[PDB]
Design an enzyme around this catalytic site. Structure first.
Site, mmCIF file in Angstrom:
data_model
loop_
_atom_site.group_PDB
_atom_site.id
_atom_site.type_symbol
_atom_site.label_atom_id
_atom_site.label_comp_id
_atom_site.label_asym_id
_atom_site.label_seq_id
_atom_site.Cartn_x
_atom_site.Cartn_y
_atom_site.Cartn_z
ATOM 1 N N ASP A 193 0.825 -1.205 0.000
ATOM 2 C CA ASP A 193 0.000 0.000 0.000
ATOM 3 C C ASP A 193 0.866 1.264 0.000
ATOM 4 O O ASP A 193 1.364 1.678 1.043
ATOM 5 C CB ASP A 193 -0.918 -0.023 1.229
ATOM 6 C CG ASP A 193 -1.808 1.187 1.323
ATOM 7 O OD1 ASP A 193 -1.909 1.922 0.325
ATOM 8 O OD2 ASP A 193 -2.420 1.393 2.401
ATOM 9 N N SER A 252 -0.656 15.527 -12.061
ATOM 10 C CA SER A 252 -0.909 15.169 -13.441
ATOM 11 C C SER A 252 -1.149 16.432 -14.268
ATOM 12 O O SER A 252 -1.674 17.425 -13.777
ATOM 13 C CB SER A 252 -2.102 14.220 -13.525
ATOM 14 O OG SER A 252 -2.507 13.990 -14.862
#
Length: 330
Positions: free
Chosen positions: A35, A199
């Site tokens: 994770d 992004s």
């Protein structure tokens, strides 16, 4: 040194991925959920409340000759999906794919929430976010990667998750045969303890690319792709009959649909998520309403590039002095 381990979807939907991890001496192999959005290595154990164990493999520290109780240490964690767990702490030898760390904090669960109990395939979590998020008290503990870093050939790990298929976590090296083209690196902020990056935008299907900054986290422990409501609405508008359902808890679509791809930007590079990766199947057994793999982050407080996005790429988690993230197509 290096390590390399195969990671395997837990079910036919790729709801999560499990990777075998050797703990203790002799080794006890547990299948952990790696994770990159958290920083505790915790396991089902011989200390876990018996009614909360349902099929998981447990760590029994009393059978490990290298286990040592970390005196006075406890842990307690709550995850974004509402699940939680807590317990005490041992140090022990932990190996992943041939890479060994001695003295790793292994957090033994005394209690786990129902969602963990109900998932027999996941024996615990191995956190790979920054150690500043580790919950051990009163002395915070280091992640497996943080402990291994100095010994690794290069201070990196890579995630290569498969679509409906196994994939690979590598530590200490970049497998240049595992991706196509080049790896595009992008800046990381560690201010919130996550692999947080920006992004450069998105496209839906064959549509035009929209240049827009989307801050979010690279999180292998989250199944879906959570993005701003504007972006998500633009995606689902291209699927006839799709709608946001408050009763179901997100966007659903007719299972008869063909889903468009979704592209996200990494600098000037583009990662394409095929439409099929966005299908999470019937909302309930036998239903013709299917759950979407792109969902709104509104009210999460952060955008999350979960497995839906990451499995479309070869992803480099660069733990150099100034961390960065790399993405390649594959």
């Amino acid at each position: 040194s290096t390590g390399s381990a195969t990671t395997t979807p837990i079910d036919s939907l790729d709801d999560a991925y499990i990777t075998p991890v050797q703990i203790g001496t002799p080794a006890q192999t547990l299948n952990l959920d790696f994770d990159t959005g958290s920083s505790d290595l915790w396991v089902f154990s011989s200390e876990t409340t018996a009614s909360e164990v349902d099929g998981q493999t447990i760590y029994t520290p009393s059978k490990s000759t290298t286990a040592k109780l970390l005196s006075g240490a406890t842990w307690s964690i709550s995850y974004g999906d509402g699940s939680s767990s807590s317990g005490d702490v041992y140090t022990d030898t932990v190996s992943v794919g041939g890479l060994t760390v001695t003295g790793q904090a292994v957090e033994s669960a005394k209690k786990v929430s129902s969602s963990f109990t109900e998932d027999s395939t996941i024996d615990g979590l191995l956190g790979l976010a920054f150690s500043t998020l580790n919950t051990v008290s009163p002395t915070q503990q280091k992640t497996f990667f943080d402990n291994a870093k100095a010994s690794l050939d290069s201070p990196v790990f890579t995630a290569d998750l498969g679509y409906h298929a196994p994939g690979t976590y590598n530590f200490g090296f970049i497998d240049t045969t595992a991706y196509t083209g080049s790896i595009t690196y992008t800046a990381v902020s560690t201010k919130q303890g996550f692999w947080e990056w920006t992004s450069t935008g998105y496209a839906v299907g064959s549509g035009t690319f929209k240049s827009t900054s989307i801050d979010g986290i690279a999180d292998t422990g989250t199944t879906l792709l959570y993005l701003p409501a504007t972006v998500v609405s633009a995606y689902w508008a291209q699927v006839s009959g799709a709608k946001s359902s408050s009763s179901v808890g997100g966007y659903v679509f007719p299972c008869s649909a063909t889903l468009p791809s979704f592209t996200f930007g990494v600098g000037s590079a583009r990662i394409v998520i095929p439409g099929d990766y966005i299908d999470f199947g019937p909302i309930s057994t036998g239903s013709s309403s299917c759950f979407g793999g792109i969902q709104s982050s509104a009210g999460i407080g952060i955008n999350i590039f979960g497995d839906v996005a990451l499995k479309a790429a070869f992803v480099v988690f660069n733990g150099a002095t100034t961390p960065t993230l790399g993405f390649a197509s594959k």
